[PDB]
């Protein structure tokens, strides 16, 4: 029921510009919350609030935790860029 997108973002000094929700309870999806105006994600224009996050930099996070996905984003921040694979209901 979804469309999948692979999104690349350069990090800005302020980060990638979006909030991550979910993955708190078993089976709970990880997904995009608020997108910051003029941040990397907004500027790039592909990410949408509500998109389900399924992979970060080649590491799958389906069925995995909020903690893991934040860890992967912190590693991406260190390297200065991230690849996101997302799914959105269509």
């Amino acid at each position: 029921d979804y469309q999948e997108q692979d999104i690349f973002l350069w990090r800005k000094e302020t980060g990638f510009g979006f909030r991550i929700l979910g993955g708190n309870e078993p089976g709970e999806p990880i997904y995009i919350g608020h997108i910051v105006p003029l941040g990397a994600a907004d500027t790039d224009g592909r990410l949408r609030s509500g998109d389900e996050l399924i992979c970060v930099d080649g590491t799958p996070v389906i069925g995995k935790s909020h903690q893991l996905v934040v860890q992967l984003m912190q590693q991406a921040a260190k390297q200065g860029h991230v690849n996101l694979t997302v799914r959105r209901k269509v």
């Binding site: 990638f16 979006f18 909030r19 991550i20 919350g33 608020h34 909020h66 934040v70 912190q74 921040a77």
Partner: peptide, 10 residues
């Protein structure tokens, strides 16, 4: 939290 503060900012 209101939707703009919910979740972890990256």
């Amino acid at each position: 939290l209101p939707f703009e503060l919910r979740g972890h900012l990256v």
